[PDB]
Write a protein that binds this ligand. Structure first.
Ligand SMILES: CO[C@@H]1O[C@H](CO)[C@H](O)[C@H](O)[C@H]1O
Ligand SMILES: CO[C@@H]1O[C@H](CO)[C@H](O)[C@H](O)[C@H]1O
Ligand SMILES: CO[C@@H]1O[C@H](CO)[C@H](O)[C@H](O)[C@H]1O
Ligand SMILES: [Ca+2]
Ligand SMILES: [Ca+2]
Ligand SMILES: [Ca+2]
Ligand SMILES: [Cl-]
Lengths: 252, 252, 252
């Protein structure tokens, strides 16, 4: 499953013109249908432009970088109007706009209800995308859907950073496996339990017959903090060790 | 304070049907009220559906993962219509939708103006959420607000990475505290001053009577770069040291 | 170029009141114009309020932190109405709202079509921003655009983390440049090739006549994983080494 962006209300829509508000982009979702009552008008089953020319469009946008894998278009559900061809333009940085496939005119609908779907390989990578109807039956009227790849579990992570040292002579003597634990509080509590990555930025340690032995481990990670377990073994004397840590929260 | 999402214009809204555009979701914010003039209609003080059945809804969405802590609903301000019960559905990945509390029918409004608030513990974690009115007085008409936790200071950070080495024999001789500074330019200038985290990925150093002594510090961090101060002391000779750095910008 | 936020459909808009849906915020973009046909009304070339008082507004919002560098306003294109002064309020956390320049009344339009632009130095840093018309000619009617800095290449990166060790005695003997490669699969495949940053969190190694020599390198990075090349040289015997890695994907 890809994501149906309009169905999920993921994108802002902006048309060039509307026939009136009862023909607005709010009425443009694929398969949109309203009351079948012939005595009261509740709006077109489509966006319909006001101006009929080759310069009309709907822009769809949001802040996220989307990978668009398809677009589907359909005509108007309640009257004989539909877009028969269009062009597509898009932008990643919202400053520089590009023409899809050098301004290819894409062949579109030929009736009220049949769905015509264009697939993108590779995906169009964009923050905003615009459909530009070029030809039409009766009126520039359409329904549509944009399909994007779902967001990855690893996207938009939250991050907190710090440093942690032994800070005393706890590991500076003795024999065999020896550890000390420093408890670290994150500056702010996370909403779920992060992972904690660590890297050494100071070693002050004595070899044991030429062998250096030191290790750091992040352990007992909660939303509030974690334990840096400093570890030596054999007969090494560790005077101090310092780690920077990067705590990363996913999915929140 | 939680965030009033509609008040702050944080979510796109999409209804199943509207009575017409003058009854659209744009009119649905909690406590919405317009001109009290009886001679001109400026729109309902509510969203109102067009179709009256058990299949109508408003979807609210955006790209961010929200933690919804409450929903409030209210009836229509200018006419005797209000939703008396509803269901809620939501989605995190915008592909898979779930029914809140196994499709619990929530008891809602009984007049025009009184606010009925449902609290979520734990918070509903979602990109999009849909209210599905089930029963109503007169018409499916509502006002509403969604309340989410505020965004954390640590969310959506910007990141730049690199590596930095001594690259010569500056630290390879001498006695006592000795340092050298390498200035590092970020590939692109940040908008505010980042933190810089560092971890060692190369040691080429001589012990001093068995003691190893090396340290790296990021210092003098600006929007443009920072100084990696490489440090040794006692009588160690450091031939080379290499750090990877992770520069993180928050709040921008 | 800064970003034209409304042109690019980047922000949700919410007005206090609309004269009706045919005067809604959907009609408010700078230079908006529709059919010049005098016989059919397709909507005002502006947002127009319904209530005329000092309490009307449009809020523009989305989840991203924007750096607003300018606002432009214009009157109504199709009738003699325009906003002659306004105030601005904004919010970063969507809980706490601030008044721009202590509630400065900004002098605005004096006709239908001329654009009046206010520049912000420093940029207003905000998730949502509201224009509050204070005085007007004929009606509270406006067109507008908000201009923000473009998003940086380094924003909203995706991140994956892990750890990698030699895990055997491959580097524990021998002379001269010696390496072993551990291949690392990311828990999930990236959409483009990430950078991989590394930091050491365990050293178990023997000096060679007092010299310590160890290095780690991330190499052959693909969307699926990378190689950690563990390196020693001279005559050092490395028993084990462990790195945490941070893989960062940009622009996706
Ligand atoms: C204590 O005996 C072993 O010595 C080895 C070096 O020869 C490594 O340091 C091992 O980790 C250690 O357990
Ligand atoms: C120079 O005397 C001290 O020696 C110690 C080892 O015994 C540590 O290395 C200290 O950092 C150092 O200051
Ligand atoms: C092998 O001879 C050299 O020895 C030096 C120490 O004196 C450093 O370790 C160099 O990297 C190494 O190449
Ligand atoms: Ca109908
Ligand atoms: Ca009214
Ligand atoms: Ca007109
Ligand atoms: Cl070391």
């Amino acid at each position: 499953g890809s994501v149906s962006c309009l169905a999920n209300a993921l994108l802002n829509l902006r048309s060039s013109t509307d026939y009136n508000a009862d023909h607005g982009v709010k009425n443009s979702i694929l398969n949109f249908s309203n009351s079948k009552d012939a005595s009261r008008f509740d709006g077109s089953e489509s966006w319909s432009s006001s101006v009929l020319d080759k310069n009309q469009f709907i822009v769809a946008g949001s802040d996220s970088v989307k990978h668009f894998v398809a677009i589907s278009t359909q005509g108007r559900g309640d009257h004989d109007q539909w877009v028969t061809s269009y062009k597509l333009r898009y932008t990643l940085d919202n400053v520089n706009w590009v023409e899809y496939n050098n301004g290819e005119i894409i062949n579109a609908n030929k009736d009220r209800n049949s769905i015509v779907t264009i697939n993108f390989n590779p995906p169009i990578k964009a923050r905003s995308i615009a459909i530009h109807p070029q030809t039409y039956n009766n009126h520039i009227s359409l329904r549509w859907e944009l399909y994007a790849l779902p967001v990855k579990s690893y996207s938009n992570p939250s991050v907190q950073v710090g440093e942690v040292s032994i800070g005393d002579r706890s590991l500076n003597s003795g024999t065999g496996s020896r550890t000390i634990v420093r408890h670290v509080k994150f500056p702010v509590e996370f909403l779920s339990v992060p992972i904690v990555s660590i890297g050494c930025k100071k070693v002050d340690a004595h070899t044991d017959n030429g062998q250096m032995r030191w290790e750091g481990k992040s352990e007992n990670i909660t939303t509030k903090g974690f334990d840096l377990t400093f570890i030596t073994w054999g007969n090494n004397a560790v005077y101090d060790l310092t780690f920077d840590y990067v705590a990363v929260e996913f999915n929140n």
